[PDB]
Structure 1
């Protein structure tokens, strides 16, 4: 029987193969929400072309592409199986992938969900911690889709816009941290320093009121409480690019700083994403752990395994959707408050799109 409930899994996405790099960058540079560039329609295609080689090279170093779709698909399948058993009344559940900058695009997904004639659609962001640059961007895409297509939705919409402290998400993180701690030499386990690492944000974004830093911090505290503060930690930020100021400490400088100060046993913990991608396989594993860590003289540096295919994570996803359905919530209370210094007109339209949904 036809699907009744569609769960739209939102993520930025990553190029699956080296050939997809260029268009990935192009869609990025054309996103007005994310960037404001002079003669953007001409620069974007250009900057995309110029940066493609370097980014293709990064992906080549990790196998030739991003595994995000594979992991998202696996998580989505496991989620659905559980949902059908957890919430029979919401008939067959079907997951859809809505990537922001690669296929399948958010728009392509919405089109399919509508074609499937679903009764309800749930915008389920895959970023546990809300950032206007990530989840916000994905939600704006949904609102903009219908606004641009000049048609109203044929399905009842709602969103799970954030879930920084979901108990099962926390357990997965804690479990992966513990098993990785077991991989360190036993004589240095207690000496191990935990560096939670999350993608950074330009200070200009943080200073406008972005909810991200605070939520990421919340996730870290929850994980450490569950670990009973077994090891000391610090929350640091990676992926900064450009000359502008970003939220620090930077993960690379922190790794180097710690080593130079005698803390040569480090456990990196990606805390703001649920699957492997360029951030973990290239930035953390290659440039920081193999090169930087090497030249600084670390003794042991490891990275907790990304959630990926952990069955407990699929359970978390299903639990979130199930609880969302039972509560009848259209969105979090947090989504009803835009950044104090928000200057993007769509943000308010997007929140209204969700808070105003029928039912």
Structure 2
């Protein structure tokens, strides 16, 4: 049977092999939704070239590439299997991967959805908490694709643009946390401090009104409420680079600070993504857990397993799509409000692209 409903799973992506690092960086430095640079068309290739060896080495240290596409594919397959059974009125469903900066690109996926002759298309961000830099850029890329090719869409579009507190997402995190807690020595379990760690943002982005940290905070509170506040926690922020001010405290400084203050049993939780990648496999596991924490005299540090192939997570995704379809929503109410200090004219046009869709 011909596919009727397409689910476009949006994520930034990561280089599958060390060879893919350069083009990954190049596409990213060319993204003007993500960042504006002087003489950008010339600086982008240069910075990409400059950072490539260092970034290649990081991927080498985790096994030679990003597992994002594998996890995204498995999650997508599980989601589709479920949707075909619980939403027959919209079946057959098909998932499409649209990575922002690596193949398959958002544009390539849209091309394939069109050729497949879908009746309905759903832009399903794989970031549960909205940031204009991630989800925003991915949604902008969809509007721009149609603008650039000078044609209207042939499919009815809509977006699931955020889902920071979906009860099944919450259950998966809480589940993974309890599992990791079971892996601490029993005598230390109650003493464990939970560090929720989300990718930081530079303060220039926070200060223009980015909804990300408030939504991340909502996810954290929902998870802790489900865990009945069994352990104390803090939300901290990782991956800052460069000399500018970013939102803190930093995950690395917090780990060190905790240890210096006698809290030497720490559970790291990657609360802002749904599968592994460099930020967990290299930064958290190698840099912070193996190296930093050893230097600080930690007793036990562990990290909750990423959601990855958890079947309940596939159920979360299917439920999200199912409710979205049944409610006839075009986008969240939140998408109808741009940042109070937004300075990117495409944000408004992208917002309108979704809110104005024919039903």
- Give yes or no for TM over 0.5: yes
After superposition, give the CA deviation of every residue in 1:83-106 in whole Å (9 maximum; x if it has no partner): 000100002000000000000000
Match of 1:318 in 2: 318
1:256 is displaced (CA, Å) by: 0.3
SS, match of residue 234 in structure 1:
strand
1:163 is displaced (CA, Å) by: 0.2
182-191 or 35-44, which deviates more: 35-44
Q: Distance in 2 between matches of 1:256 and 1:204?
A: 26
33-42 or 213-222, which deviates more: 33-42
Match of 2:272 in 1: 272
Q: Distance in 2 between matches of 1:136 and 1:253?
A: 29
Q: Which stretches in structure 2 are left out of the alignment for 5+ residues?
A: none
Q: Distance in 2 between matches of 1:311 and 1:120?
A: 25
Q: Distance in 2 between matches of 1:38 and 1:80?
A: 43
Q: Which stretches in structure 1 are left out of the alignment for 5+ residues?
A: none
Q: Distance in 1 between matches of 2:64 and 2:301?
A: 25
Q: Distance in 2 between matches of 1:32 and 1:174?
A: 37
Q: Distance in 2 between matches of 1:88 and 1:36?
A: 45
SS, match of residue 268 in structure 1:
strand
Contact 2:11 2:98 in 1 (8 A): yes
Q: Distance in 1 between matches of 2:192 and 2:91?
A: 48
After superposition, give the CA deviation of every residue in 1:151-203 in whole Å (9 maximum; x if it has no partner): 00000000000000000000000000000000000000000000000000000
SS, match of residue 196 in structure 1:
strand
Q: Distance in 2 between matches of 1:86 and 1:52?
A: 45
Using structure 2 for the length normalisation, give the TM-score. Answer: 1.00
Contact 2:83 2:91 in 1 (8 A): no
1:38 is displaced (CA, Å) by: 1.3
Aligned residues: 359
After superposition, give the CA deviation of every residue in 1:1-35 in whole Å (9 maximum; x if it has no partner): 11000000000000000000000000010111111
SS, match of residue 64 in structure 1:
coil
After superposition, give the CA deviation of every residue in 1:19-71 in whole Å (9 maximum; x if it has no partner): 00000000010111111111111111011001000000000000000000000
Superposed CA RMSD = 0.4
SS, match of residue 321 in structure 2:
helix
After superposition, give the CA deviation of every residue in 1:257-314 in whole Å (9 maximum; x if it has no partner): 0000000000000000000000100000000101100101100000000000000000
Match of 2:186 in 1: 186
Q: Distance in 1 between matches of 2:164 and 2:248?
A: 20
Runs of 4+ in 1 over 6 A off after TM superposition: none
Using structure 1 for the length normalisation, give the TM-score. Answer: 1.00
